[PDB]
Amino acid sequence: GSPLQDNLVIALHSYEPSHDGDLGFEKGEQLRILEQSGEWWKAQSLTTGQEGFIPFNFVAKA
Amino acid sequence: GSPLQDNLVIALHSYEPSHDGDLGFEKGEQLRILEQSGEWWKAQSLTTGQEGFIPFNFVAKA
Ligand SMILES: [Ca+2]
Ligand SMILES: [Ca+2]
Ligand SMILES: [Zn+2]
Ligand SMILES: [Zn+2]
Predict the structure, then answer these.
(1) Which of A7, A43, A42, A47 minimizes the C-alpha distance to A28?
(2) Residue B44's domain spans which residues?
(3) What is the CATH number of the domain that holds A20?
């Protein structure tokens, strides 16, 4: 399928960043994963379009 | 040893909470773990004395 395949997640919990370049999100927000190595994934919000690093346990693939 | 044994952690990354009852902390802050089941652990900051739930990947046992 498309490039979104294995690369869409839903936030399980809200996240407020505390480090420049980290991305916040609301619970239930959908994000596109750009890079998924280590415990901080590069993502793009499908709500705001903004990009940055997210804590991987706060989201689930769907 | 003492009850602190297996129950002290150091924050690997800062955390800003976004849910009542969740506990924020600075990078390098030391916390006492009160409960360590699931991915949200009940903790007490050894900086502020405050208690609440923390995301377990943000800390490391020491
Ligand atoms: Ca998990
Ligand atoms: Ca970890
Ligand atoms: Zn960070
Ligand atoms: Zn919470």
Answers:
(1) A47
(2) 1-62
(3) 2.30.30.40
